[model samples]
Target chain A: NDKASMTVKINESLPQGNGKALGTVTVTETAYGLLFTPHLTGLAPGIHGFHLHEKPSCAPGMKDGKAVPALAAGGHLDPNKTGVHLGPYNDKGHLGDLPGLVVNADGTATYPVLAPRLKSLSEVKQHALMIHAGGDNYSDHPMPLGGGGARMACGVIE
Target chain B: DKASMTVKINESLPQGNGKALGTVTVTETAYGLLFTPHLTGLAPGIHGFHLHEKPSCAPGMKDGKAVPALAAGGHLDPNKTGVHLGPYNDKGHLGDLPGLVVNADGTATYPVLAPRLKSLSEVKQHALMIHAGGDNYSDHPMPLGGGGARMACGVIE
Candidate 1:
């Protein structure tokens, strides 16, 4: 039998968007869906947005004439190309939106989250996991992409 | 042929912000295996460094204590002597090596020589671990050569 599990080491991004190693996040295939467990430290307090990006790269690169950090990772893992950010609850939205990650006063966070749409690890095997510097509103509101400002950290899903 | 490779050094535990602490370069030279370490963002002082038996840095529970890099297993004791002598003693654990010293600037750069190691081929698929504390060069002073806690690690791939 083949069991699927992948561990990603999330790293801090340089001001110019280069990646530096930081913490770990493990994703396991469960009977229900994909189980995501994040063990991380050294993040600013409050809520941060999390998502599984389309590409497997966390490198700094150019995107539409603008240099963006972790931009090489592409947008959310929207195989269907929905082009929406409706959060994790809405099926019509991009499947990559996870709940806001809450960091502790001690500068660490460890918690398990589930993504129902993610049934197999193969869909994201070559993807990227990203943590935004700002919180997520989970909607295409006044500001697009839930206002998750900078890509603070990222890891390859290999 | 001379073989050389670079391994990323990362935090052993989920303490600091996720960032690469540094790196180590292993090169097979006429003299021996040359280990050139370029590390930063560490507490300035001596730190225990060693080669582990496995190429994993996954954390797990050991002896009821949540140990960092528990998957790296014990020292590279291929000889099975189970002793913690420095790298020179052929009868001791092959993982043993001279410790690392960090400067007041929190940066460290020192090239360590492992004369017993003939080539990079002998250690290509192993794990390199750094301990939080210092090494006493003996099992008596502290268990496993007195490395208090595993601080960082890199796989020699």
Candidate 2:
């Protein structure tokens, strides 16, 4: 199939947990890029930073004596080991970076986001789709990873 | 300031199983509302899709039974046509739209056209619904084109 689907849920532990289901996201191959279409609810209304992580797992991991949300998913999918955090449009930084997801005031993310740099499923398949609680400035100057704080929702692309 | 819109369709399982089916991206084009549905996990074949009068997708009482998505109210009939016609008919309710086709693998990726829909602001305050059955777009067989049950529901806001 030219497309793949993943069911996203709230992290099993946090101020939000218990794996409450939010919705499904369909990733399809398009001429422009990989289109990530979300059908989700119960999220903070606004823009959220998202990316394809190196690991496919959504398990939480310990970081400096405290557990970090989705720490087991590792970092961005950087095969070349690009140490910089940049926007989706740049090829010099992490390729896992994608455009921010625009969620509606109704706490739903129904819009589709296009990763213009990625055109195939082969690269992102088996990776984790991680949603951060905050929006990404798509820069690394004042903060890292566009200051996207705390992993919020996640799903593994199959 | 808005140029387009999207609706998140969810399986209206009231205990809140809350599984989102997919999304419909709508853009007011030169023709009408251009609906691009990126939906999945549905039974193969055609299904009835419409815009409802209310934004609520909550279940409501129907004959003393809790009807799923009944709170969404009926099709967008601001004109009070009461007459149910197909999308092409100007006489039909504004909510009347073309049927949604689901692939054998259970997905609806194709885009459909609604020629008579005029407002994005109007739709923003309403709900979008998908019926459990197919639609021949006729009222004679059964009221509301025989499209039974609110199988999948979405919010336009």
Candidate 3:
């Protein structure tokens, strides 16, 4: 079917492995890209970076012989292999870029963010959905990946 | 002879680390298939668990988005009974299992019985999946027993 749906459970990444998850983000294929409806809790108040990674793993993986948390998910879902970390509005970088998620004072977040480039779930079915510890400026200025720090929570888009 | 098998449950939607949540032991009994799960690292509450039609757990793309073990397809229904009627109903989905309760200590050790299940051989080559939400045994309010997102899974081999 052209229409599809999936859910993403956001879980904390512990020092050594995956932690408990407290919230879910429901995704529905829409005429205007993928609609991400989040119903989550247990996040720090304020904005956080959200994106889709190339791989579907939410486990810790190795890169260059070093243990990189969430590295197994690979980089952004750049089907074109653009190799740049631009914001969602740009057409030159990864298409996985998304708007920042705003958490309330109660450590919960609810909102809808659209991934305009994602035409269908088939393109991202085996990918990873990640949330950063901090907010995203959507720029690669002084730091890479919009300066969004550690990979705090993640989920596999199944 | 009593048929039995062990299914290793791994975090179905892990980010970058591969780890086991625990294990579920399925044994054939005169009453049905007995499922005993010893799991941890889950939220304290009720969650949906089921049997999938495929044995593969590899992630792949669907409409370009990455999905976890999407190859597993829908719940197992060899009988073509396309309903979510809980374990008590014979006209419901064959993969339906009772809700799993994760204790406050992040550990689960509850046992469930599938009376309709005859033996381990009938479930061989399938997949077991744990959902993020609870199952209501119906399609209303939510679909597929409201089992939310897939949290972990294991092959029945």
Candidate 4:
């Protein structure tokens, strides 16, 4: 049988600051689709964008800033063939885009999001998730998740 | 002692997802820095990397899924400037976190970098963090620049 449940942990290194990040992503596949709820602790205030990526590795130097290659994760997990990676709301966005993460004054955050077009849980398992430095407006000014800068933190959906 | 230091954490399977995470070169030319780990034992792939906001208090994870490391703070962007991705960005993606590497046997070669402390006395404490995803050059079609998860991590000294 196909079990539709998993967890995603977010650990990040902010840009040039001493503030660390520890968060959690809860995934549950229901009749509607895939639901993601994230709870973060020990983080800074303000909202941050979050999403699921297309890779399942956390190796370093593979992208620019910290993840050096910059193309290691591939792209957003928009398996549905969505045009782009949008968050908060919008049908034409990436599967990884959750509503966006929120932090409290005490440095804790909790958010709930759902993916109605995901194909399978295996897809979620193979992909990686991440949190951004900005908010998720589900558009482009900029980019997805409001073009949030820096990786902030990342986790695999296992 | 005004100098920078670098530490290369050799990666292995017993350490989860044995891969060559390259080498973590620490440079302390202006301030002192330290590193710590909270989680370990992760999968194999390229993900966003950073010196983080803290240090690794422990080692990698078992499945490398969710052990929750020292929780390195945000990318080390003391300047408050947000631009660029990793090593290639000039405005910079956080602190230009040195990326990670993987090996052939499903293990990891973790390497963490540090600040170039202008003086030994200027060094401060810090941690190393690993994400569950990869980076996308800070570009987007992919949100969060399309990077993924928060996986394993360890400290640097």
Candidate 5:
């Protein structure tokens, strides 16, 4: 059966909160869930946090007194307004926390990951897909948002 | 000089951190590039082989874990065909080479020919990847000819 598919352009966020094109991640709706296949380069090796931010914008936002990268995208998508961050599986917290995106040592992320909770494309359209610089533990105990440091890459889901 | 080079191959590291396997001496032939593999300590069978896009043979991340030689990237498809056909075929991945067979004693000294590659110089800065399983030369039931994991790798510098 035919399903919905879309490609999101991922960009490396600069200090000025500007995004540079690294590659693209194709999101395809499958029978199980949504599949995000990335074709990227020039990234630090390790697992990075992947999530769908609330806003569709990929610009900087004013936090306190300084410009923050991708702050305009708001926090993780909590459609139910669940202030808790229980990760992607909990369903009680923010539902936009996707599985970690692994980048290879060669600065490439070619492997595809799945978001079992996301069943349709409409749930992700008009949102900002963000990638954090560090790994995501998917918990709120040790750190907030799995302690994923700095928003590394940002993309607007069209 | 006809131009020939040798690649220092290893047992793909981490998963295959066992030892340095051997080498593959590639020479320019009249028709194509002849890959003479001199590897050992591998499972005796036909192993899928290819020339990966990147030159590094370091392990890479896949499925949230480190995979052997994953950093080598995909096959050398300069045309961006994205097809995984065998070396003898056309309109396929240019990096796709003939399947390499290891002997019962765990050695692969046989010479395989890649007619698509014109000379040894052409394959320079590409990593030679050895897969865990055999290849049917097509992406049929599986991807990358069901090569499984990358077992060994060598960058042809």
Candidate 6:
């Protein structure tokens, strides 16, 4: 059987510290890349850096309610070993890296993006994924572009 | 200003031993659809599971290798629900997914389901993981999967 035959669920609970914005996350394997959809509730207004981290360890009592440590998830999911900041395009690295998130006027967010290189569904069970506390320049340097300060929220692959 | 959002990462123990399988089921229903590994296969034992507020996937260890799961922060409380339980227990961390159960041969038989029970296309980008040991229903071990050592990991789909 094809290891990539099933459509697993990727559900996240509430963030610990930040502000407790509860919501759900959806993912599907597309013919070209990986499809990511989100529905956020109870959040501030602004942009937040987002990406696939290196590990999956969402423990409680962590700083800002996040569980994992800094750099524990390694760099971005660049698998290609490319430098960070590789946004939606594959100019230099994997397109799985996301820029940032935006909240609506109703203190909520609902958006969608895509990761091209993410071809299969099974490949996601070996790395980390996350969202920063700030914006993502999709570049490198200059304070890590996206400003890696606090790990606002995090989770593991399995 | 900084925005507050929710991040959930679910898993299935298809093997029924006490570990996850295939890919780590992760979802973020805050802003948009954020999903990862459709399934995953974790080690033998309990794991500290939760959806932290950061995107930090740093690996913690116990016996040697990186901890199967990540950190162990508080529960999801946009309303300050305090330390709660799992599957919308309305007590512990809101990110608290249903506990997993892996088999002895290294296979799990859990299902990838969450509180809202939504689809994968409607989730936001968050993190998902598996720890090394088993979770005693408490955060005493500080980090390190609440038990010790990371076994396996991966990013979601």
What would the per-residue lDDT of candidate 5 be over residues B1-157, giving only the tens digit for each residue?
A: 8667888888887654447899898887554576778899988667899999998888877778878888899999998889997775567898998777565578877556566777767788998999998777789988988898898998888
Model 5 local distance difference test score: 0.80
DockQ for the candidates, in order: 0.01, 0.02, 0.01, 0.01, 0.02, 0.01
Model 6 clash count equals: 142
Kindly provide the TM-score of model 5 when superposed on the true structure, using C-alpha atoms: 0.54
User: Would you list the clashing residue pairs of candidate 5?
Assistant: none
lDDT tens string, model 1, B80-122?
9988876555677888876665555777664555656767778
Model 4, A34-59: lDDT tens digits are 65666878765655666677787543
Query: In model 5, which runs have C-alpha deviations exceeding 4 angstroms?
Result: B1-157
Q: Give the per-residue lDDT digits (tens) of candidate 4, residues B1-157.
A: 5254554443322334333344344444211232221222445444556545565434335465533443454556665656535542345544444334332233443322232222433323554455666555464655434544445444556
Which lDDT tens digits does candidate 1 get at residues A1-158? 34579888888865476554668988887544566777898887555788988888888877677778887888887877899997765578888876566554456755355565677888668888889988777788967888887788898888
Which ten-residue region of model 3 chain A has the weakest summed lDDT? A110-119
Residue by residue across B99-150, what tens digits does model 2's lDDT show? 7756557887645566567568868878888888876567878888878888
Model 5: docking quality category:
incorrect
How much of the true A–B contact set does each candidate keep? 0.00, 0.00, 0.00, 0.00, 0.00, 0.00
Docking class of 6: incorrect
Off by over 4 Å in 2: A1-158, B14-17
Please provide TM-scores, in order, for all candidate models, with all chains considered together.
0.48, 0.49, 0.49, 0.42, 0.54, 0.40
Error of 6 at B138 (Å): 45
Best by TM-score: 5
Q: How well does chain A score by TM in each candidate?
A: 0.89, 0.89, 0.89, 0.74, 0.94, 0.69
Instruction: Give one digit per residue, the lDDT tens place, for model 2 in A1-158.
Output: 23443344333324323266787777776544566778888888667788889998887788788867677789888887888878675677899998777666577776566666786878887788888888876788688897778888777777
TM-scores for chain B, in order? 0.92, 0.93, 0.92, 0.53, 0.94, 0.50
What lDDT does each candidate get? 0.75, 0.75, 0.75, 0.52, 0.80, 0.46
